[PDB]
Structure formats: C-alpha cells, structure tokens
Amino acid sequence: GTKEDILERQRKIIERAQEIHRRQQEILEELERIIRKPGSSEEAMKRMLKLLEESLRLLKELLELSEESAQLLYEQR
C-alpha cells in the first residue's frame, strides 16, 4: 500500500539520519582522541582537518535528510 511506502520512506530517512549521527560522533571522538594523544604532529593536524571536513559533510547530509522528511510532514499534515 501507499501508506506502507510512506512508512518505509520515513524509516529510510530517519534510520539513515541516525546512522549519520553515529558516524559524526565517531569522528567527533576521533578528533578528541588525536588531541589528547601525546606526540602530536603536523600530520596529526592534517588528519583532524580532514575529519572536520567529513563531519561537516555528514552534517550537510543530515540537514538535507531532516529537510526531506520535514517536507513529507507538511504534505502528510
């Protein structure tokens, strides 16, 4: 049914968004671990800079996911 398709669409977005949260937090902790880890270097900073980009891109996707489902909510309001 079309109602089931909606439910699956909702799950797809929400479940994905939850996985994005996980990925963001994993990177977030990695950033902390690098800082707290002794014997830091220029390459360590490069690692963090790349990680920061990745987590930002995840936040971008996350926002888009929220926007997609937000529009769904409107249409199904």
């Binding site: 439910l7 909702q10 799950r11 929400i14 968004a17 939850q18 949260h21 963001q24 937090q25 977030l28 950033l31 902390e32 800082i35 707290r36 830091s40 900073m45 963090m48 800079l49 920061l52 980009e53 987590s55 930002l56 936040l59 971008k60 996350l62 926002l63 929220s66 926007e67 489902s69 937000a70 769904l72 909510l73 409107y74 199904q76 309001r77």
Partner: protein, 82 residues
C-alpha cells in the same frame, strides 16, 4: 486525529537545523584552531571544549530524531523512551 503531531515533528526538524548550523560553525572554529595553532596546548584545550559542546548538540539532535520517529512514523505507538 490531530495533525499537530506532525507540526510538532516539523518544529523538531527546525530545531535540528539550528543545532546542525551551530555544529558546523563549531567545526569551522575547530578548523581554524587546528589549521593555525593546532600545536598550541591551550588551543587544544579550546578545541576540546568545542568538541564537548558538539557532542551535546549531537545528543540533542539525536533525541529529536527519535522523537521524529514517534511523531512521524509510529505516533500511534509508545516510542516515548526513544
């Protein structure tokens, strides 16, 4: 029933959007720190604080996400615990 259930879900998404914005700005600051003065131990202290703030933000948006699940998908269920 009450369409407000999905209007409240909309609000949560709008709150998440603000949370995400803030998180991205905090990551931008972290980039400034690491790129410029990442070798500074005091700068590391600043970065650590920011990272902790981001963690809070990710929890807030995650909790809202679990609320979305209830309000959107299974509003006739009992997904209060999240």
């Amino acid at each position: 029933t009450e369409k407000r259930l999905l209007e409240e879900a909309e609000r949560a998404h709008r709150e998440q959007k603000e949370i995400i914005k803030k998180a991205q700005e905090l990551h931008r600051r972290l980039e400034e720190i690491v790129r410029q003065s990442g070798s500074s131990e005091e700068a590391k202290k600043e970065a650590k604080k920011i990272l902790e703030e981001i963690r809070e933000l990710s929890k807030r948006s995650l909790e809202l996400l679990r609320e979305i699940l209830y309000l959107s998908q299974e509003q006739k269920g009992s997904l209060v615990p999240r």
